[PDB]
Structure 1
Amino acid sequence: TTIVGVKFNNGVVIAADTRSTQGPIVADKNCAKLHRISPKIWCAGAGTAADTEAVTQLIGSNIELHSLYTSREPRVVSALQMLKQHLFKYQGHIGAYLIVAGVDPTGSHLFSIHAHGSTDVGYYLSLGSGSLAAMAVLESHWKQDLTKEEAIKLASDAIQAGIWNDLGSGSNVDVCVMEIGKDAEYLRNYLTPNVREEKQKSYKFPRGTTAVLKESIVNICD
């Protein structure tokens, strides 16, 4: 997995690849690793997939309830403190490594959270097995005061570094852009550079090929 977060002049962008693995097998060639915590707070997650979806949805739920109670738009520092205290409580057993970014009344934010409960703030961050390939890129092309267009490319390139060079990453690139005055724009499959070539033959079988012993109708309705 490769996930990145890049801060730009009036916003933040996060991106991730879409390959899900179980050992050396690609269980899902197009999973989604960009989770919505609230409309304008999204989180990229790496590690144990069930854990990143679970911790994200739980905090997102509680964040939704906190917002309705306080009549205020959710803040990234809230999702951050809630996520981290939860992860710390479980001593690393909930394998969620996240890049939480978002815009709220106080501005644009980008933080990272490791499974054990520590957080970091930065202008560009990456996590996942592809973390090193992505960071090599971020360390080569990041510069301060990037434009929205430059940040999307930078974050997109970092993910590509991982897709190509990490066996733990692959398929497509998902991006979510959170700009200070606008609605968050989730760009699912922003880049699709790994389409399978057409197969050399068609494996459609002639009907009757399979030997059937018994056939019967299933009753659905009560």
Structure 2
Amino acid sequence: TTIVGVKFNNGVVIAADTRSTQGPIVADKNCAKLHRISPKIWCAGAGTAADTEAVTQLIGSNIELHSLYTSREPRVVSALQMLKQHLFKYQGHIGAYLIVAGVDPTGSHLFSIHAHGSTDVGYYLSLGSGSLAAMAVLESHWKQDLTKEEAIKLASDAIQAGIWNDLGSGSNVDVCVMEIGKDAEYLRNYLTPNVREEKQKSYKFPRGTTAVLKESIVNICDIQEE
């Protein structure tokens, strides 16, 4: 996994690759690692996939209820505080490593959070097995006072570094842009630089190739009338 977060002029952007692995084997070639906590608060997760999802759905559920209780739009610091206290309580056994970003009435925010419950603040962050390849790009090209278009470019370039140079990362690039005073735009498959080439041959079989013993109709319908 390679995930990044980058701040800019009037907001924040996050990005991720789309490969999920099972050891050396690729389980899903187009995984969605960008999760929604609230409409304008999104997080990207690395580590144990089930944990990053489950912890995100849970905090997002409680954030929604909190937003309804208080008649206010959810803040990123609330999602952060709720996540770290949950993760800290489980002493790292919930292997969720997240980059949390979003906009709220306070402004734009970008945080990282580790499985044991520690949090960090930054203008640019990277997590996952490709974090070093991505951070090399961020440290080379990041500057103060970035534009929206410059930040999206920097973020996707950082993800590409992970895609090409890290074996745990691959396939496509997802992006989510959270700008102040605007709806967040989720850009699924923003880049698609790893399309499989045409195969040399078709392996469609002649009908009747496979040997069969028995056939039977399966009753999926309910018990019938009359």
Q: TM-score range by the shorter chain?
A: over 0.9
Gaps of 5+ in 1: none
Q: Partners in 2 of 1:162 and 1:118 — Cα distance?
A: 24
For 2:84 and 2:146, locate their aligned partners in 1 and report how far apart those are by CA, in whole Å. 29
Q: Which runs of 4+ in 1 moved over 3 A?
A: none
Query: Deviation at 1:60?
Result: 0.1
Shift of 1:147: 0.2
What secondary structure is seen at the aligned counterpart in 2 of 1:202? coil
Aligned to 2:83: 83
Deviations 1:7-56 (A, max 9, x none): 00100000000000010000000100000000000000000100000000
> How many positions carry a matched residue from both structures?
222
- Compute the displacement of 1:221 (Å): 1.1
Q: Distance in 1 between matches of 2:122 and 2:153?
A: 18
Q: Report deviation, 1:76.
A: 0.1
Deviations 1:143-190 (A, max 9, x none): 001000000000000000000000000000000000001000000000
SS of aligned partner of 2:100: strand
CA offset digits 1:65-85 (Å, max 9, x no partner): 000000000000000000000
1:97-149: CA deviation from partner (whole Å, max 9, x where unpaired): 00000000000000000001000000000000000000000000000010000
TM-score normalized with structure 2 length: 0.98
Separation of aligned partners in 2, 1:10 and 1:99: 19
Equivalent-residue separation in structure 2 for 1:66 and 1:146 (angstroms): 33
Q: Which has the larger radius of gyration?
A: 2
Alpha-carbon distance in structure 2 between the residues aligned to 1:108 and 1:142: 18
Give the Cα–Cα distance (whole angstroms) in 1 for the partners of residues 90 and 145 of structure 2: 38
**Structure 2 residue 43 is the aligned partner of structure 1 residue 13:** no
Tell me how far apart the structure 1 counterparts of residues 181 and 206 of structure 2 sit (CA, whole Å): 58
Is it true that 1:218 corresponds to 2:215 in the alignment? no
SS in 1 for 2:110: strand
Stretches of structure 2 lacking an aligned partner (at least 5 in a row): none
Secondary structure in 1 matching 2:177? strand
Corresponding residue SS for 1:193: coil
- Provide the TM-score with structure 1 as the length reference: 1.00
CA distance in 2, matches of 1:146, 1:215: 65
Q: Percent identity?
A: 100
